[PDB]
Ligand binder design. Structure first.
Ligand SMILES: [Cl-]
Ligand SMILES: [Cl-]
Ligand SMILES: [Cl-]
Ligand SMILES: [Cl-]
Ligand SMILES: [Cl-]
Ligand SMILES: [Cl-]
Ligand SMILES: [Cl-]
Ligand SMILES: [Cl-]
Ligand SMILES: [Cl-]
Ligand SMILES: [Cl-]
Ligand SMILES: [Cl-]
Ligand SMILES: [Cl-]
Ligand SMILES: [Cl-]
Ligand SMILES: [Cl-]
Lengths: 202, 202
């Protein structure tokens, strides 16, 4: 659990190619923003054991932090499916139409693949709150730990926990020799100011 | 299994509101076509036991008919998730981009919520064939048994099996007293010629 789980999960994500790092040759995201990292947890679908380890971890986060949960909401659908089955709970998903039942007062936990800028997380929470549900919080597989997302969730009073995060993944990548100390500095600078291209030459 | 399973599943679908019948007051589908029936299996997501009974049934259809399966493809994502977990198989899904691994020669089974006109089923099969996969066939929760769909799948050489179908559901609905003999005739005529509004006054 905690730090051990974060490093173990980061190791798996790197190993299966669900998270890529290229600090010396930046990726360009669909927004046009340069980044040393990209996460695509859709790839976990192809790994039956790794995806189960992830679903078990998400379930453990829910039991630990949101034990009164009544409904699981995905945005993500596959992992919400795996979590809701392990917990024998109704599921719904949010496109902002909600598919599946989400009734007034029901206690909901959101399952997200990734917390990035916070926009997509807030969009999902807002849909559920609009429907009358009590959103307990969010559990996600990964988070880039960006200040923008942190502030958005804090301001909306949404508790959020992730199985692994950028910090753990940077450390594991260095332990593995994928990156070194020079790239670690670039990774640290990107997280602090992701839209500022100074990180590229940090 | 077989007829028993089809009637049991139809009963559950009616009971949870996943299939509606209104032969005396036709629905208008998004295409503008009048219909005595509508199926929305997204509602099964809210029913932990019923959805498990469905996933177990889909798994049984795959074991019975497509035993050499290597990958489960959803289009549907939640049920493909439940089936792939029970079978410990990699999963992918098809939007026609394929998310998750679908490699050359891998034996794939498609999991569909509903077989209607055949268009959406063919679209999914074609994407997987284009990717180089061997599509073993399709398993679905429900089928309207329309001739249009039957012919499209036959012409593309795609084997298709459904847990329940229109015929079983009509029979169960009559047994339950939801519909009678007069409405049964209207239902029979719609299936034969769904775009011809003579069924409305059959
Ligand atoms: Cl992701
Ligand atoms: Cl695996
Ligand atoms: Cl495997
Ligand atoms: Cl709680
Ligand atoms: Cl949808
Ligand atoms: Cl986000
Ligand atoms: Cl709330
Ligand atoms: Cl459906
Ligand atoms: Cl249920
Ligand atoms: Cl329940
Ligand atoms: Cl086979
Ligand atoms: Cl997608
Ligand atoms: Cl179809
Ligand atoms: Cl094929």
């Amino acid at each position: 659990q905690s730090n051990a789980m974060k490093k173990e999960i980061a190791s798996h994500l790197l190993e299966i190619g669900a998270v890529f790092l290229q600090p010396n040759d930046p990726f360009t995201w669909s927004s046009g923003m340069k980044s040393p990292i990209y996460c695509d947890n859709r790839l976990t679908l192809s790994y039956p054991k790794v995806r189960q380890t992830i679903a078990a971890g998400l379930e453990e986060l829910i039991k630990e932090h949101f034990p009164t949960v009544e409904v699981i909401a995905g945005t993500g659908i596959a992992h919400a499916a795996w979590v809701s089955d392990r917990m024998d709970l109704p599921m719904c998903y949010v496109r902002n139409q909600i598919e599946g039942k989400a009734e007034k007062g029901q206690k909901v936990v959101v399952v997200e693949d990734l917390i990035s800028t916070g926009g997509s997380a807030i969009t999902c929470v807002e849909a559920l709150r609009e429907a009358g549900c009590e959103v307990l919080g969010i559990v996600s597989i990964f988070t880039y730990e960006l200040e923008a997302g942190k502030e958005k969730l804090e301001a909306a009073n949404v508790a959020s926990y992730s199985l692994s995060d950028y910090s753990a993944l940077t450390e594991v990548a260095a332990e593995k020799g994928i990156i070194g100390q020079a790239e670690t500095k670039k990774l640290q600078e990107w997280r602090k100011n992701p839209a500022d291209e100074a990180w590229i030459t940090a």
